[PDB]
Paper text:
RBP-CPN was designed to consist only of the βA–Eα1–4 elements, which are directly linked to α9. In the concentration range 0.5–5 mg ml−1, the determined molecular weight (MW) of RBP-CPN is approximately 27.5 kDa. This corresponds to a dimeric conformation, as it is about double the expected monomeric MW of 14.9 kDa. The crystal structure of RBP-CPN was solved in the monoclinic space group P21 at 1.79 Å resolution. The asymmetric unit is composed of four chains, of which two pairs form a dimer via a segment swap. Unlike the interface of the two lobes in native PBPs, the dimer is located on the edge of the two central β-sheets. In contrast to the rest of the central β-sheet, the two βE strands form an antiparallel stretch of the extended β-sheet. The novel antiparallel stretch of the dimer-swapped β-sheets has not been observed before in proteins with the type I PBP-like fold, and the existence of this swap highlights the flexibility of this structural element.
Periplasmic binding proteins (PBPs) are a class of proteins that participate in the cellular transport of various ligands. The structurally symmetric bilobal architecture of their fold has long been thought to originate from a duplication and fusion event of an individual lobe. Here, the crystal structures of two permuted halves of a modern ribose-binding protein (RBP) from Thermotoga maritima are reported.
Residue numbers in the entry:
A (entry chain C): 1 to 128
B (entry chain A): 1 to 127
The structure:
């Protein structure tokens, strides 16, 4: 129980709509309240969103960043407020391979959690 | 059911031993057969592991890479063979902070599964 903030870089691109909407739905299925914050590819809007999320005292943040400067600053602010952040994105490697990524500074000491998540992801993929 | 390959960069460090053991246990709990391949910090052995995994027809790969550049080529070969890869690792970011990473060649077009996993990570962290 608690509330999770879903911060998405945009909602005019389908990949991000699916990401934001599915994350909200899964949080609600697990017993959380969840709200989507749309940064609209704007640094100031993303920063304003973190202002409200920190003020509201959300329990966790699912964060799709708009860049690699103001966004890491916003993550730092959430950490100082004691709010864990789990970042989600997709990118293209130097050789062209596209990869979808989840990362977080919270769980580096928890190999059991990371192993279970990776296997559960593979399981959901294979069974569908 | 199915069969997953667990490719670990080394079995000479506790974090990686626990990672590999837990991945094998979780795969079995979820109804899969699982096999561990120890790369022993050797890109040649990692590549040879992917050689045998592709030939054996594994259904999924849980991948802890030895290197950043050379190991991405193994993710390509698996994708070329139609085997989905789910990578788990830890790195040091540009600000010098340790970061835990889970990533895949899947969910780059329809990220429903990755979205759910990110929320489950947060939930398990909170509980």
């Amino acid at each position: 129980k608690g509330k999770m903030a879903i911060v998405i870089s945009t909602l005019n691109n389908p990949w991000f709509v699916v990401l934001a909407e599915t994350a909200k739905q899964r949080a609600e299925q697990l017993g959380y309240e969840a709200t989507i914050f749309d940064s609209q590819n704007d640094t100031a809007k993303e920063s304003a969103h973190f202002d409200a999320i920190i003020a509201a005292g959300y329990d966790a943040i699912i964060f799709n960043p708009t860049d690699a400067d103001g966004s890491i600053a916003n993550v730092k602010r959430a950490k100082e407020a004691g709010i864990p952040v789990f970042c989600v994105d997709r990118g293209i490697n130097a050789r062209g391979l596209a990869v979808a990524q989840i990362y977080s500074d919270t769980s580096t000491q928890f190999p059991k959690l990371m192993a279970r998540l990776a296997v559960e992801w593979a399981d959901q993929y294979l069974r569908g």
